[PDB]
Amino acid sequence: MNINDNLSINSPVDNKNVVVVRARKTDTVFKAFKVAPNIWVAPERYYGESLSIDEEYKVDGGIYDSNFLSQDSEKDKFLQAIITLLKRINSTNAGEKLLSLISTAIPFPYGYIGGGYYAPNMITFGSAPKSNKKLNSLISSTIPFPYAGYRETNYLSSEDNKSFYASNIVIFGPGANIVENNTVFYKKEDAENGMGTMTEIWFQPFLTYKYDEFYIDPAIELIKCLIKSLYFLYGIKPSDDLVIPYRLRSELENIEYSQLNIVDLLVSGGIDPKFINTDPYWFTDNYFSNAKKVFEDHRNIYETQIEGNNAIGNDIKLRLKQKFRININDIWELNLNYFSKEFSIMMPDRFNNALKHFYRKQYYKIDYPENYSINGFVNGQINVQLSLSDRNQDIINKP
Amino acid sequence: TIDLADGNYVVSRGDGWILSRQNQILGGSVISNGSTGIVGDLRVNDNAIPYYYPTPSFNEEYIKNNIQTVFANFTEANQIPIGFEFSKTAPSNKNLYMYLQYTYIRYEIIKVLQHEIIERAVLYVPSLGYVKSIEFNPGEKINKDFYFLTNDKCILNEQFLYKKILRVLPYSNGLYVINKGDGYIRTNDKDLIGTLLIEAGSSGSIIQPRLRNTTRPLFTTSNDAKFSQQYTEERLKDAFNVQLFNTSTSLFKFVEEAPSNKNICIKAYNTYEKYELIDYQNGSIVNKAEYYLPSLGYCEVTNAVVKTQVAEDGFIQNGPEEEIVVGVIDPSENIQEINTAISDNYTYNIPNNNPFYILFTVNTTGIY
C-alpha cells in the first residue's frame, strides 16, 4: 500500500490515474483521482444532492453554501487534505490493515452471461499450414474464449461509455449540507444479498468542533465512514427497519423513543454498543443468521469454482481469496473503540450519534498544510491553535 | 440509374465493403524467411457500432426499422460471436507485410422519382475482415494505393437485392415428432455468417464459437395453448433427448486454402434442424408446431450488377432429404405398469374412465 501524494487538480487527464467519469447514468461528468488501488478521490461536491435547498427542508445544525468547493484552489486543497488524512491513517498498522482490506474487498462478480462460475467454453485458433503429407488442419492453439468473463459491478464509466475503471470507494466532498459526513451505496439490492457494491463517501475535512476540552480529528470520522462502507462492500447491509432504541426523549411530555440503525451503533463505537453485544447475546435477529449463511455460501462458491478456474485474471481471484480470509464476526466486532486506542484519539463516547440535542457545536477552520500533519493535529489534540470559522453565523437552528 | 418504379426502396449490396482511410488502423504484421503468420479476430459481437449516414427523410429509426423488417436484425440478434483468420507463409528469402481491415455490409434506402435516385441513405454493419499482403525487399518503393484507400469498394460480392418500402400418412391418432432434415437457412442471407476472400497462396478460416446457454432456436406454433415452447421442448426430449444446452458447448469452423493461380471465396451461413410436432387426430392435422434447433452451419465456395428481388420469408434446406418419424406417449393420459410378465395367459383388471397406457413385457417370444 502506497498513497499517491504526487497529484494535483491541474494534473493531466492520463486516463490511468486521473479520469473524467460519469455520475451513475445521469448527464453529468466529474473528475476523479486514484490515490490507491480501487480507491478514488473526487474533490468536487456530490452530484446527487441539489445545492439549492428550500428553507423548509433544511435540517437543524446544517451549514449550506452552494459556492463551496467551486473554485479549483479549494478542490486542490481538499484533495491534498484527503491525501494527508489517508497518510495519517496508513502511518499505523491498524490503518494499513483497514485500507488493505478496503482495497482487496471488491464486490463479488456476477457469473458468465450464460450463468455459473465454473469454466468458460473453448475455442481453437491458428490452423497450421498444409504440410507435404499431412493436412495439419487440427494442429492449432486452444484458447478460453471468454477469458475473464466474470461480470463486475464496481466500475466507473468514462464520458464516451467506451472505457471503464475499477473502483471500490469514491470520496466526494460534502453534499447540500456542508457539515454532514455520509456514506451511500451504488445499488441497494446488491448491498443486502451478500454480493456487495461500490460505496460513495461525502466528507468535510476543513471543519471540526470542540467536545469537552479537545478537538475532533477528522481521521476518526473518515475511518467511521470507511467502516460503514465495508458493510456495503461485503453486501451485508441490514434492512432499514432493523432499528433499536437509543435514547428516551425525556424533554418531551410524551413517551417517545429515539431509534438508531444497528450498523450505526456497531460502527460508531463508544459506550452504547457495550450494553448491546453481550455474552450471551440478548438481542438477536434473522439478519445475522442470513448474513452468515450467505457469506458461507459465497465462500464455498469461491473455493469450489473460482480457485480451480484458470481462465480468469488473478486481479480478481487473489483479492477474493483475501476478502474471504476474514470472518463476518470480525467486521461486526470492528468499531471506533479499537482505532481510538490504537491511534490514542479522544472522541465523544456517550450517545455520540445524538449530540445535536445535548449541546450546540462551534466549528473551527483547519489549515491542513499547517494545523494537521501526517502525525495528527500540530501541537497535539488539546493545544492546537485553531481559529473559529466564519460560517458559524450560517448554522441552521430549528428547535 | 434505376429501372424500378417510382417510390421508396430498400437495397442490400452484400458484404465485402471496405471503407476509406481505415486501412491500417488495426495494425499489421511482418514475417521473415519461411515463418508463417496468422492474423485474425474473435469478437463476442456484444459491442456493435453500425455506421449510419441518414438523410432528412430517412432518419435513424426509419433506417433501422425498414432494414430489420426484412434483412437480419443487428440490434438484439447481434450477440452471436464471430471469428475469422487468415494465414500466409513467407517465401524462403524475403519479407512479408500483412495488414488487416474490417469488411462491412452496406444497406441503403433510396427514393426514386422519374426513374432516378434522388435521395440515398447508407448504413454499414460490421461483417468479417480482409487482409492485404505484400512481399518487400528493404528500401522498396510501395505504391500509395496499397496503403491508402480513398473510396469505398466492393471486394467479395457485388449484388443488388431490393425490396419496396410500402402425400397420404397411414398414421394413427396421437402426437408425432418428425425430424425433417438438417441445413435449414433463412432466406435473404438472414443467417449468413459472412464471406471471405482468400488471395492466391493464402489460407482462410471462419470460426463460429458458442457461449454457454446463449443459443436461440426458432419456434412457430399454430396453437400456443397446446403446443407451447416448453411442451414441444419436453416432447422433443422424450422422442430424441433433444436439449438446448448441449448445442451451446459446440463449435465449428470452415477452412479454405487458395491455390497460387486464383483466389477463393468462401461463404458461410448458420444452419438449423427442423422438428415438426404434429397431432394427427381423425386423420387430419389439428395442430402443428415447427422447432428449429441451431445446427453446425453450412458453407459454400464461390468463384469470382443484376438486380434481384428479396425472396418471400421462408427456409431453404441445403442438407440431405430426411424425415424421421417418432411417436410419443400423450402426457395427458396416465401410464400403469404390469410388473409380472405374461407367461401363457393373463387377465389384467383395469384400475379413471379416461384413456390410459398399460406397459408390459413378454417373458417368452411368441405370437400372442
Place this chain on the structure above:
Amino acid sequence: TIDLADGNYVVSRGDGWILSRQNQILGGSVISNGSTGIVGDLRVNDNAIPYYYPTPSFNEEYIKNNIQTVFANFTEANQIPIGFEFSKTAPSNKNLYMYLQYTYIRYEIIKVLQHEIIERAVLYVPSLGYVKSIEFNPGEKINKDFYFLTNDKCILNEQFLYKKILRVLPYSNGLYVINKGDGYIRTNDKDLIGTLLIEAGSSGSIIQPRLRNTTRPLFTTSNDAKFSQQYTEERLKDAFNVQLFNTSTSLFKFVEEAPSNKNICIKAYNTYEKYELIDYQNSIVNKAEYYLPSLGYCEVTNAPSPESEVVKTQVAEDGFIQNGPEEEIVVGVIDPSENIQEINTAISDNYTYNIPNNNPFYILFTVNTTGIYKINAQNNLPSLKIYEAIGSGNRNFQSGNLCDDDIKAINYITGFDPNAKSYLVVLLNKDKNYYIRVPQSNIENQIKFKREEGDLRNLMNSSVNIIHYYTRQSPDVHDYISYEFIRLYTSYNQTLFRVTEYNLINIQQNLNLLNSTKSIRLLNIYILKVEVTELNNYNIKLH
C-alpha cells in the same frame, strides 16, 4: 574478469536461460504410432513472477527499477497473457517422449572493482518455454544429461549487453498527419514478446490471443501547448477514423516448422505504427509522434552462431528501428479552431455568397454538375484556399442539397497563403464535397462562383495572381501556377496565353522558366503559366 571501469553496471545476459533441476517438474508427454502431440502454456499469472537473487548492495527495488528503466518493463507485461506451443510428430513405428520447461531472461547488476567483479544480483524473468524430445525404444538407457541439469545455461546465443549507472515539403499552411509505416520496435529488445528454440522436426508457435484487450501506446510531443494525447487522438480520428487507441481485439500468431536437419530460433516482438502530427506553417513549427500498436514482428535465426566468444557490448541509445516497409502517407486535417459554415443548397453556375471578424474561417460546398469553376472574391482579394474532402460522395446523397458526411480529411487542391490578390480555377465533380478556407473588418468580400463555359479550361486547377520579380507559395511538382500580367524566368523551381478581354489564345509554349533569358516579344494583358518540374525551393519566383 571484466575489462570495463569501476563502479556499478546493469547487465542483461539475454533470453533463453533454463534453471537447474527444474526440468521435469511440468511433466512430459508420450506419443506413439505416427500420432502428433502438441504441448504449450500461457504466461499469464502464477507463472510470470520474476525470481530475485539479490545481494546486500542491491535490493529487490533497486534491481527492479534499474532493469525496468533500461530494459523491457516486465511488471506491466505480467498481466497480458502470451501463449506458446510446441508440436511434434512421432514416426510410424516408434515411441517419442517430450518434456517442457520454462525459459527465463537473465539480468545481472554488478559492482566492478579493479577489473574484478565483487558482487552480482540476478533477476530471472519468465519469458517462454522450451521442449526437449527424444525417440526411444523400451529398455534404452538415456544419458542423465537429457533429464537433469546441474547448472544454469543459455541455450540461445550468449550476450552481455550492459549500461553503466550514472527535403522540400510543398505543403500549405495548416495541419497534416503522416503515417510513416508499420513495424517500429524500441531498441534493446524493449518490445520483445520472446524467443523460441525449435529443434529439428518440431514446430513452434507464438500467439497473442488478446485475452486482455489492453495495449501500451506511446506519445511524444514537442509542445504540450495546443497538443496532447486527447488532441492528437481526436485529430487522428478525424483523419484516419481511428476508433480504438488503447484497445484491440486482433490476434497475431507466428508458426515456424524447423527442417529435419537443423534448429531454428524465432524471435517475436511487438510492433508499432508511427503517426506524425505536424503543424507546417510557412518550416515545421510543431511535431508529435504517436506509436499505435501493430500486430507484431517475427525474426528467424536459421541457427545460433558457433560458440566462439561472448563479446561484450553496450546498449544502444534509446530510440526506434523500423522493420516493415517504408511509407509516408500524408492526410490533411481541418483545424478545429477555425469555424466551418455549411451551405444547405447545392451550388449552380453564377452563385454569390456573402461573407458572414478578421479570423480565418471555412465554408463547405458542393456543385450541382461537374465542371470547372472560378472562385474570386470582391476585388479579387483576399486569396483563398480550396481543399477537397476525401471519400465524400460515396455515401448519403440528397438531390439538390448538401448532406455532409462529417469527413474531416481534406486534400489540398489549390491556394496561396497574404495581401496578394488572386482568384482560383478548379475542376469539381457533382458528388464530392469541397472546403474553402478564407483568411481575414471592411465591407464583406462576397465569394463569387462562376461556371466557366469552356473558356479558362487551359488554366485548370490553378490560382491566377492579379499582378521586377515576384514570389509566392509554390505548388508540388506536376502542379500548375499562373499569373496575369520583356523577360521571365524561374529562380530555383524549374505557358504564354493571349487574353481577348474573354477569349483565349496560345501565344507561346514550351517556355522553360529555368533559362534566365526570355526574349519573345510575341505579337499578341497576358497569362504566364508555369508547371513545376523540380521543387528545388520552397517558393517559386517569376523574374
